[PDB]
Amino acid sequence: TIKIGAQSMTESEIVANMIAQLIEHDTDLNTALVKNLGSNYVQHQAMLGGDIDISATRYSGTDLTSTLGKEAEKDPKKALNIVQNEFQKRFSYKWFDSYGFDNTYAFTVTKKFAEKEHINTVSDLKKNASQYKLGVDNAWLKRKGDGYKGFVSTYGFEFGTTYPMQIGLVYDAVKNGKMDAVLAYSTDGRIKAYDLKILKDDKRFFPPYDCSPVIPEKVLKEHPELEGVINKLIGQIDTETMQELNYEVDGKLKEPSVVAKEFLEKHHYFD
């Protein structure tokens, strides 16, 4: 039984269901989802513990700064190479090449608010920053390297008030004028659907967040058919497609498993 870990993000559940289904289509391996994992730390500890054999979604910038204790590399190619080499060297874990998308933190406002306050970049927020309410996820305020503390020393301002909440709620919160700005995730389909505006990170504070699966080399050796299955998804999901997939769950309220199945069917399970 191949155990597949999903973080409690819509995107993680879709991709975990996708891996599960493709595995059972291609092979005789049985699969189980391990859901609601709180963070990459919980994920990483679960894999060290043998509780999961596959992380469906891990993000180069997040593990670089937290699991590996390293400085936030800002170049995508370099950050991915560093994460790949370190996961091999430290754990004999294989951090695959990316699905094809970067899911980054992104400061997001409405188009009405942008035009009113004259906002195109994150730096544009500085001028009235104490008047603003920012909605953020439940972990960002406390993160090291790529969190609020680092944000403040790079950008040289803080927001009037910051509200930590479940990520899924920040999209409606900003549409509804409850928050003035939110730290959204770039792959959420609600940015498109709600016509929200992503602000340029003009000081390149955030590292890249290219998304990949992670699997111990030991699991890959035990089940040699498994690598080829995962390889089918590498490079197949660009950010536009991930946004579309996410919205099917968060906007149309479909089950991650339904959304993953229709995607695999559209692409003929990549053979």
Under the rule (CB under 6 A), what is the footprint of ligand CHT? 59, 62, 103-105, 185, 209
**Cβ at position 108, least distance to ligand CHT in Å:** 12
State which residue, 14 or 226, has the beta carbon closest to ligand CHT. 14
Residues 53/21, Cβ–Cβ less than 8 Å: no
**Cβ at position 115, least distance to ligand CHT in Å:** 26
- Nearest residue relative to ligand CHT (C-beta): 209
Residues 247/192, Cβ–Cβ less than 8 Å: yes
Helix extents (H) in the chain: 10-26, 40-48, 60-65, 76-91, 111-117, 148-155, 170-175, 190-193, 217-222, 226-231, 239-250, 256-266
Q: Give the residues across from 108 on adjacent strands.
A: 182, 198
**Cβ at position 52, least distance to ligand CHT in Å:** 16
Side-chain-facing half-sphere of 120: CA atoms under 13 Å? 1
State which residue, 87 or 105, has the beta carbon closest to ligand CHT. 105
State which residue, 93 or 206, has the beta carbon closest to ligand CHT. 206
| Locus of tokens 């998804």 | 233
**Cβ at position 59, least distance to ligand CHT in Å:** 4
**Cβ at position 185, least distance to ligand CHT in Å:** 5
Distance between CA atoms of residues 254 and 7, nearest Å? 18
**How far, CA to CA in Å, does 196 sit from each of 109, 114, 190, 271?**
6, 10, 8, 37
- Torsion angles phi and psi, residue 33, rounded to 5: -90, 135
State which residue, 73 or 229, has the beta carbon closest to ligand CHT. 73
**Cβ at position 240, least distance to ligand CHT in Å:** 16
Q: How far is CA 185 from the centre of its chain?
A: 7
**Cβ at position 36, least distance to ligand CHT in Å:** 14
Look at residues 79, 80, 70, 16 and name the one whose alpha carbon lies nearest to residue 46: 16
State which residue, 39 or 128, has the beta carbon closest to ligand CHT. 39
State which residue, 17 or 220, has the beta carbon closest to ligand CHT. 17
Residues 95/215, Cβ–Cβ less than 8 Å: no
State which residue, 55 or 104, has the beta carbon closest to ligand CHT. 104
DSSP for 231-270?
A: HTTTT---HHHHHHHHHHHHTT---HHHHHHHHHHHTGGG
